[PDB]
Amino acid sequence: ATYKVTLINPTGNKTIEVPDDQYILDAAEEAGIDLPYSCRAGACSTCAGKLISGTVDQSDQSFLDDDQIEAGYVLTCVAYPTSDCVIETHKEEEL
Ligand code: FES
Numbered sequence: 001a002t003y004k005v006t007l008i009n010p011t012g013n014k015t016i017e018v019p020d021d022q023y024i025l026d027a028a029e030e031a032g033i034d035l036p037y038s039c040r041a042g043a044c045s046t047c048a049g050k051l052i053s054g055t056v057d058q059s060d061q062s063f064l065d066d067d068q069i070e071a072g073y074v075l076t077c078v079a080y081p082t083s084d085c086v087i088e089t090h091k092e093e094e095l
Contacts, residue, residue, distance in 0.1 A: 004084040007033065008052070017083050024049070024056070025077040035076060035089055042078035045095040049074045054085020068095065 005018045007028065018027040025047060028035050038046035042061035051072040058064075058079035073095065074087060 003054075004043040005054075005081050006086040007035075007049075008086065008088045009090060020080055020082065022080070023077060024079050024081060025072070026088070028076070036092060037077055038045075040077045042065045042075050045075075045092050047075055047077040048091045048095055049076045049087040049089045050084045050094070053086060055080050055082040056080060056085060056087075062095075 001020045002017050003020055003026055006013060006051055008017045014033060016027055016031045018024060025035055025037060038044045038047050043063055045063060051074055056074050056079040058074055060078040061075045063075060064073050073091065
C-alpha cells in the first residue's frame with residue numbers, strides 16, 4: 001500500500017505518497033522536503049512530529065514513552081504510515 005501523508009509545517013503544508021515500507025522521513029527527503037533529524041534511529045527527539053489524523057507504525061522507536069505515543073507523537077525517521085495521515089512536523093521541543 002502507498003499512503004498519503006500530509007506534512008504540516010509552521011508556514012504551510014504538503015501532501016506526498018509514502019509507500020508503507022518507507023520511513024516518513026526518507027520519503028519526505030526524496031520529495032525535496034527538509035525535515036529536522038539527528039540520530040535517524042528512533043533514539044532522540046529531533047525528528048518528532050504529531051499525528052493529527054491517520055496511523056503510523058513506529059515499532060522501531062525507543063525514545064517515546066507509552067503516553068507520548070498515545071498523545072500522538074511520532075519519530076518521523078522511524079515511522080511507516082499505516083493509513084493516509086496528517087502530521088504536524090518540527091515538534092521536537094514539545095518533548
Ligand atoms: S532523528 Fe533521532 S529519533 Fe528520529
